[PDB]
Design an enzyme around this catalytic site. Structure first.
Site, mmCIF file in Angstrom:
data_model
loop_
_atom_site.group_PDB
_atom_site.id
_atom_site.type_symbol
_atom_site.label_atom_id
_atom_site.label_comp_id
_atom_site.label_asym_id
_atom_site.label_seq_id
_atom_site.Cartn_x
_atom_site.Cartn_y
_atom_site.Cartn_z
ATOM 1 N N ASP A 1 -1.164 -32.475 55.427
ATOM 2 C CA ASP A 1 -0.510 -32.002 54.219
ATOM 3 C C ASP A 1 -1.484 -31.991 53.043
ATOM 4 O O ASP A 1 -1.727 -33.028 52.411
ATOM 5 C CB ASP A 1 0.691 -32.916 53.921
ATOM 6 C CG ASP A 1 1.450 -32.510 52.687
ATOM 7 O OD1 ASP A 1 1.211 -31.396 52.201
ATOM 8 O OD2 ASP A 1 2.285 -33.315 52.215
ATOM 9 N N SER B 1 -4.714 -17.255 41.810
ATOM 10 C CA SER B 1 -4.785 -15.976 42.486
ATOM 11 C C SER B 1 -4.897 -14.874 41.436
ATOM 12 O O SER B 1 -4.346 -14.986 40.341
ATOM 13 C CB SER B 1 -3.542 -15.784 43.364
ATOM 14 O OG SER B 1 -3.472 -14.477 43.891
#
Length: 330
Positions: free
Chosen positions: A35, A199
């Site tokens: 994770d 992004s």
């Protein structure tokens, strides 16, 4: 040193991925959920409340000659999905794919929430975010990667998750045969403890690319792609019959649909998520309503590039003094 381990979907929908981890001496092998959005290595154990164990493999520290109680240490964690676990702490030898850390904090669960009990395939979590998020008190502990880092050939790990198929976590090296083209690297902020990056935009299907900054985290421990409501609405508008259902808890779509792809930007590069990666199947057995793999982050407080996005790429988690993230197509 290096390590290399195969990671395997827990079910036919890629709801999560498990990777075998050797703990203790002699080794006890547990299947952990790696994770990158948390920083605790915790396990089902011989100390876990009996009624909260249902099929998981447990770590028994008393059977490990290298286990030592970390006296006074406790841990307690709550995840984004409402699940939780807590307990005490041992140090022990932990190996992943041939890479060994001695003195790793192994957090032994005394209590786990129902979601964990109900998932027989996940024996615990191995956190790979920054150690500043680790919950051990009163002495915060380091992640497996943080402990291994100085020994690694290069201070990196890579995630290569498969679509409906196994993939790979590598530590300490970049497998140049595992991706096509070049790896595009992008800046990371560690301010919130995550592999947080921005992004450069998105496209839906064959549509034009929209240049827009989307701050989010690279999180292997989250199944879906969570993005701003505007982006998500633009995606599902291209699917006839798709709608947001408050009763289901997100966007659903007719299972008869052919889903469009979703592209996200990494600098000037583009990662394409095929439409099929966005199908999470019937909402209930036999239903013709299917759950979407792109969902709104509104109310989470952060955008999450979870497995839906990451499995479309070869992803480098670069833990150099100034960390960065790399993405390549594959």
């Amino acid at each position: 040193s290096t390590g290399s381990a195969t990671t395997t979907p827990i079910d036919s929908l890629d709801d999560a991925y498990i990777t075998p981890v050797q703990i203790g001496t002699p080794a006890q092998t547990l299947n952990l959920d790696f994770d990158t959005g948390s920083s605790d290595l915790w396990v089902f154990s011989s100390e876990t409340t009996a009624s909260e164990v249902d099929g998981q493999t447990i770590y028994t520290p008393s059977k490990s000659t290298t286990a030592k109680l970390l006296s006074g240490a406790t841990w307690s964690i709550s995840y984004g999905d409402g699940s939780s676990s807590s307990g005490d702490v041992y140090t022990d030898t932990v190996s992943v794919g041939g890479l060994t850390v001695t003195g790793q904090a192994v957090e032994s669960a005394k209590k786990v929430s129902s979601s964990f009990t109900e998932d027989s395939t996940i024996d615990g979590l191995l956190g790979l975010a920054f150690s500043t998020l680790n919950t051990v008190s009163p002495t915060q502990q380091k992640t497996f990667f943080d402990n291994a880092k100085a020994s690694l050939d290069s201070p990196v790990f890579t995630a290569d998750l498969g679509y409906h198929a196994p993939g790979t976590y590598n530590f300490g090296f970049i497998d140049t045969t595992a991706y096509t083209g070049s790896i595009t690297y992008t800046a990371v902020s560690t301010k919130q403890g995550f592999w947080e990056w921005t992004s450069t935009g998105y496209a839906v299907g064959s549509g034009t690319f929209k240049s827009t900054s989307i701050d989010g985290i690279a999180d292997t421990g989250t199944t879906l792609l969570y993005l701003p409501a505007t982006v998500v609405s633009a995606y599902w508008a291209q699917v006839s019959g798709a709608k947001s259902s408050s009763s289901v808890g997100g966007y659903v779509f007719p299972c008869s649909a052919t889903l469009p792809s979703f592209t996200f930007g990494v600098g000037s590069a583009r990662i394409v998520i095929p439409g099929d990666y966005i199908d999470f199947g019937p909402i209930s057995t036999g239903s013709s309503s299917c759950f979407g793999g792109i969902q709104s982050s509104a109310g989470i407080g952060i955008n999450i590039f979870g497995d839906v996005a990451l499995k479309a790429a070869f992803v480098v988690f670069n833990g150099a003094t100034t960390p960065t993230l790399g993405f390549a197509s594959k």
